[PDB]
Structures are given as structure tokens and as C-alpha cells.
Design a protein around this ligand. Sequence first.
Ligand SMILES: [Ca+2]
Ligand SMILES: [Ca+2]
Ligand SMILES: [Ca+2]
Ligand SMILES: [Ca+2]
Ligand SMILES: [Ca+2]
Lengths: 148, 644, 613, 52
Amino acid sequence: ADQLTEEQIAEFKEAFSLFDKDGDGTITTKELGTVMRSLGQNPTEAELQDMINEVDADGNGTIDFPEFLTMMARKMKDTDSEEEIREAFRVFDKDGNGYISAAELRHVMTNLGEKLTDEEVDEMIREADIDGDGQVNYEEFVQMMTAK
Amino acid sequence: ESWAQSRDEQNLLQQKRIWESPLLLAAKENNVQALIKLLKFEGCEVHQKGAMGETALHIAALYDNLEAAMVLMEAAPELVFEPMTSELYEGQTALHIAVINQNVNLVRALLARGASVSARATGSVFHYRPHNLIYYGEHPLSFAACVGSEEIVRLLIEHGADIRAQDSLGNTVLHILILQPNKTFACQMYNLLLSYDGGDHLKSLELVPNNQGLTPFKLAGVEGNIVMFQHLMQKRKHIQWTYGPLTSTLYDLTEIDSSGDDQSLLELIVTTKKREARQILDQTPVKELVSLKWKRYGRPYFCVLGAIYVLYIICFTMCCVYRPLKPRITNRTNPRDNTLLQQKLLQEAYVTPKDDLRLVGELVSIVGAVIILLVEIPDIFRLGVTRFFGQTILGGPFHVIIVTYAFMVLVTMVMRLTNSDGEVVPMSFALVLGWCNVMYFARGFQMLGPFTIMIQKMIFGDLMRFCWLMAVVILGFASAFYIIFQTEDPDELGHFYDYPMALFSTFELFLTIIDGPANYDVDLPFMYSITYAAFAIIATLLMLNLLIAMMGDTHWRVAHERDELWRAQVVATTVMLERKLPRCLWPRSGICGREYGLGDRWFLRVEDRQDLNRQRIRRYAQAFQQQDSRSSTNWDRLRQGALR
Amino acid sequence: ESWAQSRDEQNLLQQKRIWESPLLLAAKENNVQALIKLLKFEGCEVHQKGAMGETALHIAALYDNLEAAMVLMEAAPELVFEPMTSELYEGQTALHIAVINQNVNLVRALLARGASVSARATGSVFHYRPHNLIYYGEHPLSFAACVGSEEIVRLLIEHGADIRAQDSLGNTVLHILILQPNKTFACQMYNLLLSYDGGDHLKSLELVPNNQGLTPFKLAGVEGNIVMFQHLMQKRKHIQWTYGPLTSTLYDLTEIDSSGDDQSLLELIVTTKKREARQILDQTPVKELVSLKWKRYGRPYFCVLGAIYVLYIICFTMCCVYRPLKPRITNRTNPRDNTLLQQKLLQEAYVTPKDDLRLVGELVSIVGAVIILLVEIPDIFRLGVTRFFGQTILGGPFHVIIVTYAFMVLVTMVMRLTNSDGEVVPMSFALVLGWCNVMYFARGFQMLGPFTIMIQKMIFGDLMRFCWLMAVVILGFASAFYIIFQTEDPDELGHFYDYPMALFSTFELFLTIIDGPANYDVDLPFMYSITYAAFAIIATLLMLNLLIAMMGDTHWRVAHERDELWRAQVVATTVMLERKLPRCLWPRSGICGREYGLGDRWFLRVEDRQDLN
Amino acid sequence: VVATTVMLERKLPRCLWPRSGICGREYGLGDRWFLRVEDRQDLNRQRIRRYA
Ligand SMILES: [Ca+2]
Ligand SMILES: [Ca+2]
Ligand SMILES: [Ca+2]
Ligand SMILES: [Ca+2]
Ligand SMILES: [Ca+2]
């Protein structure tokens, strides 16, 4: 969790917020129970407490975001390490939230030119948007830089 | 600017007095050998100064030299407390510098020897100023919790540094973290401030306003901090129930729509100048309100107040077209050029009862022009003229036309009942400012709105840089045209007879509205044709047809930001009414407490579709389970736009 | 609205009863240790209600509590049958809530204890309305088959869940899946439903239309469902042979067009409003017909119908300029300004046969105005007046000009044979409409079609946001120009001699078509120059020269919809003639059967190029 | 702009422009004219490294 960047916490926090069902900042066996029996398989109220209490460091029975982060330290994103792509993203991202959206990237090309139509911008996203939310992660942006 | 220059001379002077006085220079280059062989026998000089009155201890932290720093505390165990006696760096202690350079071992060495953890770094560079490069407050805890070294932040609390600590702006450490731009660590650290303390039950420490009276939740509305605003929204966001893809969410809404007590976050947004704060209006617990508050109430009350203005000008137009007029009072037009066969009446004509009906038509006006002055002048004393002659469009220049309107009507009232002659002139500015002030009521229309933003954004910004160009050229050719025709008849081809006509006729050939002078009965002078054709190319097909391209240059480069202006025009129209209308007819927004078991605050209910998307969460669930062509070209250029 | 606030008050009152009534709170918190104590010696209470009249089973179902519902099924085994009963929620049962929250082990429990799988979800929130978010039909099979829980789909059919099921809107379970926008599964979930269509009667479960008569093949095209349309198309596409890269395939064409009774899919496409229901024209069997129906048959009949129209308006125009006129009946130019030396005839002079040759000419153009009313009064007879004054461009405002042109000529017929003076007024509108109505035939041309839509888009869309800016600025300076020249001669420099002239003069100084009031023999009043120079800047180089950039901004930004509309302008022109021209000259498009052993469905041949090995 | 600054600098006498920057030889510096610029690192790139 130490050698992260701004684009990896701000990515994981929206992953955590969608994962935390009731929005309490913690994770129970109920809350991890709901979004796994939606995923076809059925955790039979035993792997829930086996998985959470495995990674629960302070032993409170719950998983806050840093203990969520230290499990995403061992299950971290791969060795896709760059430096120039780190710079041009903060050039691209206005508010610095790690998410370059349809409203923010349409302005960067407006500073550069060629007169993009509004529907041309949204097609630039769906080529890049792997998970399908209309916004481009840094991981979803770094594969669009070289790409071949 | 001889101030910032005077910084430099006191910074190169430090880099003279360190080449002198060798116990500084042995301290800079980490020379443990000379430091023993300058102090351990005679010494006599441990309390030296510098350009900032600093110490050798201040050098050994400013350059990361642990080794001499341990020895200087061992040799002279009294240097840790004295601050920098200076002007720029005033009050700065050696506890501060070891923090900002991340130097954990030295901080662990200074605190074990023990320094004042609440020292006042009250220097001149440290003020929140638009020229300096960092603003880190004044306290070592504030310097700790800004660079992000959270392990230091755990340590300063354990030796007793209070969170409750205000600078000259009254800011706590919570107000500081909103101001740094590299945000995204502070959200990981804002919780860590709350984890240890925040009091237990004093005020919960997030409520403490600054010297300008503002909690951190209001402060994120002014500073445009989008990440903190979502992160502070998690505290006041209550999830009610889930139903498949539907979840209903109930918001606190305590400070967002305080509805009075004019420190309101809807009030504070349309007051500021920071452009990046105006995009709070797209975050989902606020844009629900200003959709409702404007559609159910702010739309009909605005248009009804729109229609009451439309009759008022028609009540003023229909009376100005019925001035009284005497035919050619006593004179006879002698010389020339006096096609003026009427004359207005003296004030001895209110006979003929199709003239008393005029009198109510002028009396509705003069009592209508004072109610503008009864409602705009009580705005200059609460808020200065920097809102009036400031062209912040959220209540822009339509608050200075209407005041000029309410002045120009009453001048005619003084022109009447005096028998003064020229009442045409104040009445003429009364009409053209009268009708063009209905343009303000083109603000709350879905269609007519963002066109009106563009007309104002071409007056001040793309016509000013034309009219300075036009007044150069048109002063040249007019005096050139006047000289040619000075030795000519004005009877035939008389567009230029005296000089202040010769600007005005030349003003109307740059616009192609008069035809350009020509008389084929007579012989025009040979220098006219050469001069005028040279003017014809520059005026007609080189300065006007450049201006049309100039408009279309800037019309597709702000049509993402006039819609964002137009949305903020509506909210500034909405919130202005609620302060101004009496609250017998606007209900309070949302649902109150104390009838439900709620807790007296006014809540609001938002319910939305979350989509599940099946792909991103299965990627994480495989980590939760521990295991054992046109678009491509636009990204090809964007790679080539990244420029290696 | 006042209605949407009622949903707020109940859903907060729904939570208030949970803070009261301790077993419901014990049901929400999954509290089982209190629930044994609150029941197993006293109890007294079990048929509780709430704000929506639900039970503790429903509370234990809306929050995922298998343990809490376990005790409730054991305590009172008659909770599973009664539904919710309120205004918003009505008829919803605990089987429904357990389905949408994916709780497989709970649905397994409720069917074992006995739950009604035909429970009508007839509530108020469930109706297909835009102010509601999700629409899942009514039956608990539909709630499973929409969110994609295909395990529970298999679980329900084993316990007698009928596939044939219609809601209050007539929709079946296959009409529903076409309507969810987050499609993603409904290709796959479609086929699992037909995998349970093994034994039925002759109506094979897709020939069952909705309440408004629309099968799920028809519903896919009307709703703009590109993904499901091609999935349906693979069922009725027959592949004839492959030959290297040439694959010739047949298409069904039984409901693609087959324009033979009332509800052809080409008729349904160009009537709707949805932006994505118009790109079905992109897909591969439809883009062939509307080409071939137009190119061989639709194009030349449309020009003959056009070239007969121009000769009609000329025959009306050629009898318009030959009106009967007398020289100056009775008066003599009395005050001033009587530039009028003529008078029309009384209708007692049709002598001199080049005044009678016109009389056979107007009778051509007086029956031409009858036949236009006979073809458009039977158009409101079938579909309402909101088709006219709705802005549907697919046959746009060219149905309100041609009626007015028909309506204006009869007024001339009324102004004739009564001897009334003013009768240039219909004939002036008769020509400015009767010529501007040949613009309708600029439609089926390759180069002149998509220009016409741009003219139609700037009339309303980008001049109803300039005329409200024009009429304000004019109303200032026209009234201001009146006051200046009020105490002046209208003889010399007489642009403003009364106020109804004073708008008409100022309106054209805004457009820069008159020059600009100037005389140099006389001395103009000094406030004229300051006022007019501010008028010339704001109008000529700030308003008109803004509007040229206003067009050019919106010109290149929508020139991918005019090429979509123009193609759909052709299609709605094509089908308009198919239901109107009698079948002696349009054959049925395609190839029939029964000469070939085929099955009598009209077919069509398509051959393409596979470009892989 | 730069073609206008430099056109005026050599043309107006240097009793009203001064020389730009800080001179040497007052400090032990070496008689040249120096100039000072300070900027912020923007420590995002420091976090990847963190003295490694
Ligand atoms: Ca959670
Ligand atoms: Ca925990
Ligand atoms: Ca963003
Ligand atoms: Ca994404
Ligand atoms: Ca002319």
C-alpha cells in the first residue's frame, strides 16, 4: 500500500464504495455475502467469515478501506510501470480525481483542435472503457498510449 | 517590484556567511572531523547567526546531516529552542525543518531531547499569499500533515500536539488540507486526523469556523475540491433501503440549504470568483435541489415577475410617444438646415381629457422607477460596487443598466416642472435602456438562455479588440477624406463638409451602410478614387470579413462553458429569490424532522439505479478469493499529441 | 409535483414504524435472539402492518436475512401467501422481493412451503412510466428473467410457472426483455425461454402480440434494439450455399416489410420518435428493400408526381397575373399618397376570350384545391392533429402549407362572386405558399435532399432564438428614433412619420437592406448620431455577424444526423406511396413461393463476400 | 515581446534600466551576473521513488 500513486487509491476507493453495499465504511459477512451470491456462486455463510477474518488485521470483524487496501497490496496491479504516462494524465485530468471523463477529455482536445463532434468523444471512450462506465482509468489509459 | 528582489539579496547573503564562520561550513558538508576540532577545546562561538539569524542546528536539518546534528545537541544542549530571528523566516524552529525534509530519525532525536511542538512559524513567507509556493499553516503538526508523512503525524500526537490550533486566518489543520492541490493523500489522511481525536465530545472539531466563519464542508465549496466534497459527503449520507438495482438515499441537507443565515453553500457558490468551484453544481446531492427549486417554484415566479416588467415599459413607451408639442412656437427658421417645426409645451397643458389619461401613464412610471432604487441601493451597502462594475455574469451588467434606468427616468421628472429645454436626451436613453433591459428576463429560458451569455461574452472580449483597431483606421481615412474634399462643394457630393461629420460618414462606410459617395454629374478629384479604393479593401473585405472568422474562431471553443455558465445563471436566479420573496409562498425544501423520529433537520430523498456490470467486480472477486477505426486515429494523434 | 412528495412521506413513515414495533426492528437487524423471546411464549402480534401494509416476512425479505425469515416461516406458516396492500405497492408478495435480491436459498425455501408463482404485481410503482426507474412486468418469472438470475429461472419453471403471461399492458415475458437498456444478458436469457417452449399449441409463443398488437420481432425494431434485432434475425435467415467467398442467403421478409395489411415494420419505423429506432435502416435486410423499392419504382413515380405539380402551380400563377382590372373607378387622389390608379372589375366582364381563356384556367386550379382537401381531411380522419403541429420532420410542416394553400384558393372563390374589394390578400399568400411547397419535391434528390433539412432546422431551432433577440433591440431604437424625429419634418428625411412606419423602417436598418437615414442639406438633431451609431455597432457587426458564426457552429456539429434523416425521408416517402398506389404497377417486392416448394412466404435473395479463409 | 524588450534595452541608456539579475563580487561569487529561480517539485514523482 506504500508504493501506490494517486491513480490507484482513487481507483480502489470507487471500487470499495461500490463493493460496500450499505455505505458504512466497513465490510461485514452480510455485505460481502450479497455481491458474491449475485456472482453466480453461493458463499455458504462459511467462506464469508473465512475470507474476511483472514485479512482482518485489527480483529474487529470488519474491513475498512486501509485493510481493503492492504489486501489490494498483495493482489495489486501488475508491473505496468511508466513515467511519461504518469505526467500526461495529470495534464489530462482537471480535478485530479484519477478519472478522465467525457466532459474532461472533450476540453483537452478542444485545446488541441481538429473539431471533435460530441459523439466522436464518446466513441473514444468505449474503445478504451474496458469495464464500461464511461470513464477511463489510468490503467485503461496506459494501454491506449502505445497499444501496439 | 522591489520586494521579491529583496528576498534574493537575503538569500545570497546566507550563501556568503556560510563560506565564512567555519562551524557553519563544517555543519553543511557533514564534517564530523572539523566540528570536534572547532568546539571541543575552546569553541566560544556556538551561538552564531546567519542571514536569517539561524543556527548551526538549522543548517544540519536544512541539509540532511544527521551526524553533526546529534553532536551539536550533545555538545550544546540548548540550541533546539531558539527560532530564526529574522523577517522572512520569523519564528521558524529546527523542529519545523526536520519535518518537511521527511527526516524521521532527526525528529525522533529532537523530540527525545524535547522541543516545543507548538512553535509559531509566523514568518513573512508563510502567509497564505498568491505569490508563495506552499501554504502549510504555522504549526509542526500542520507541516506534518501536508507532505503526507503519516508516521510522523502519529508521533506528534503522542507527545501532545493539539489538533485544535488556529493560525492568523483561524484555520485548523482540517482547513489546510483543502488547499493543497495534490489531493488524493489528504483523503487518506483526513480520516487519520479523525481516528486519534477530534475531541471526544466538545464540538467534534469539524464545526470550528475560521476567521471568516466557515467550516471545512463549506470551504470545499469555495475551493472547488471535488474529491473532498464527495469524501465529506459520506458522513452525511444515509442509505435507507436497497431493492434490486434501486437504492433510496436520504441526505442530511443541514448546511447545503440553510435557507437563511446567509453563510449557505448555495449562497457561497454564486458569490465567488474561482471558476473551478462552480462545478460543485454537478455533484448529485445538490443538483437535485436546484432542479426542483427552480422547476416547481423558480420558474413561474420568475416569469410572472417577467411579465410585470413587460407592461411597465409599455406603460413607459406609450407615454413617451405622447409628448406634448406646439407647432413652431414663435420663431421662423431663418438660415438653412432647420427642419424643426414643432416645440414641446410649457407646463400649462393638462387640458383635453385625452391628456389626463396620459398623466396616470407617467405616474405609474415615476413610482415604478423609485422601487428599483428602493431595491438596488439596499444592495450597494451590503455588497460593494465590485459586484456592479465587476462583470461576474451571475447578476452581471443588468444591475447597472437598470440603475441607470431608474436615474434617467427621474431626470425627466426634473426636466418637467422646470421648463428645461432638452428632455429628449434623458428620455432617449430611457427607452434604449428600457427595452434592452428585458434581456435580463431571457435568463431562465431553456432555449433563449445561452445565446444571451454569448452576446455579453462578445462585447467584452471580442469586440473591444476590434474597436481599438477600428478607431485607428477610421481616424486615418476620415482626415484623409476631409482634406481631399476641403477644396470642394458641399452642394454636390457633400458627405464631408465639416470635420465632426467626416468621422460619422466614415463611420458608416466601414460598416457598408451608406453607399460610399458618388456623383456622376461632376468630376471627382483624382486622389479620391485612389484613396477610397485603398480604404475599400481594408474596410470591407479585410477587416469585417476577418471579424466574422474571428467570431467563428471562438464560438466552438467556449460551447462547453456557456452551458456551464447557463446552469449557474439559473441557480443564481433561484437563490436570489428565496432571500428576496417572503416565505409564506415558498415552502421549505425537503422533509422536516421531529414528526418522524428523525432529529429536526430537513432531509431530502434521492433514489437511483446502480448498475452491476458483472465485469469489474468479478475481477476483484478473483482477488477477494485468494487463489493458489475512426476513433483509433484520434488516439494515434493523441499519442502524438503527448509528444514522447 | 405534489405526487412525488407523497412517495417521500410514506417511505419516511415506513421507517418510523420500524423504529417502533420492536419485532420489525428485530427483523431488520437480523435479530433472532429477541425474535424467539418476542414470540415463543407471548407473541400476540404476528400479523403486523407498516406504512405499505407489509409483514415482518417482507421486512425480513427486503434485507437479506435467511435466519430471520427462517423463524417467521416456522412461527406463522400463512405469512407467505398474503401480499402487500397499499396505493404504491399492491399485490407484491415475499416471493417477488426474494427474486430481485437474488436470494436463491430463500426462493428455494418459499416454494417448499408453498408460494403463489402467479402473484400479480399490480402496484402503482410497477407501471411502465418514465417517472419510474425499472419496469419488470408483473409475474415472478419476469422479475427473474430480467435481472439475469438464470438459476432461479430454472427453479420457477419446475414449479408450474407459466410462460404465457400478459400484464396490464398486454406485454408477455419476451416483450419485457427487449425493454431493459442494460442488455448484456438478454441475448442469452432469450434462448433459455425458448428452451422451455417445447410443448405448446400452434401459437409458438412469439406470435402472441402485446395489447397494442406488436410481436417481439416488431417490438425490437420499434424500441431501437440493435443487439436483439440481429439475434432475432438469425432465426429466420436461411443460407442457400457457399462458393469460396460468395455466400447467397435467403431472408424471411414475412414481417420485415410485407406491406399487406396494416402494421408493416417499415411503417412502424417512420412514425416513431426514438433516435435509435431509426437506425434499423442500417441493418442488412432492410437497407436492401428501401433501396430497391425506391430506385426502380419509387424514384420515377415520385418525379412524375412532382413534374405534374409544377405545371399546376404555373397554371395557377399564369391565371393570377391576368386579373381583370379597371382604370380608376370613381375617385381622384384626394389628400396625398393615393398611388392607386386601378380597380378590379365587377364580375360582369368575362367577354373578350383572352379573359375567357383564363376562365377555363382557373377552373383547373379551383378543382386542384378540392382534391388536396380530399386527400388531407381523410388524414386527420385516421390520426390526430398532433401529427401536423408535432415537429416530426418525416413528412414535416409540408402538410400544413398545402392545406393553407388549398384553403386560400377557396377564399378567392368566396371573394369572387361577391364583389368585395380586398382580394389580393389570399392571392398573395396563395403564391408565396404554392411556390414554396414545391420544396417538398426537393426530397428524393441525391444532392438537394439533405440541404432542405438544414433550412427546416434553422427556421425553428435557430431563429426562434434570434427573433426574440431581434424584436427587443428593435423595440428600443425604433421607439427611440421616433422621439428624435418627432419634432422634425417628415418631408425632408422622412423615415419616421408615424410609429407603425417606425418599426418597419427600423426593422430593415437592423437587416442592413435600406441604407440609413441621412440628409446633408439640413442639420440633423445631435442625439440622432449618438443613438444611431450605437445601433449600427450592435446590429451590423455584433448581431448579424454573430449569427453567421451561430450557424457555422451548429452546421458541422449535426451533419451526421441530416444524413440519417434524409435516408429516413426517402423511406417514409416510399411507404407512403405503397399504401396509396394501386397494385398494378408496384409488384410485391421480392420472390414469392409455390412455384418453388417454399411455403408461400415472400422471399428475397442476398449474396455477399466472406473475406476470411 | 522579446523583439521589443531587447530593441529598447540597447537603445535606452543604462542609467534607467539597471542590469538584470544579481551581480557577483559582493558575495564571494565570481563577478558574473546571477539570477535566482525557485519552483515546486510536485512530489507525486517523489512518492514512486521515496529515496530509492
Ligand atoms: Ca462493505
Ligand atoms: Ca477493520
Ligand atoms: Ca474527473
Ligand atoms: Ca472505467
Ligand atoms: Ca443604397
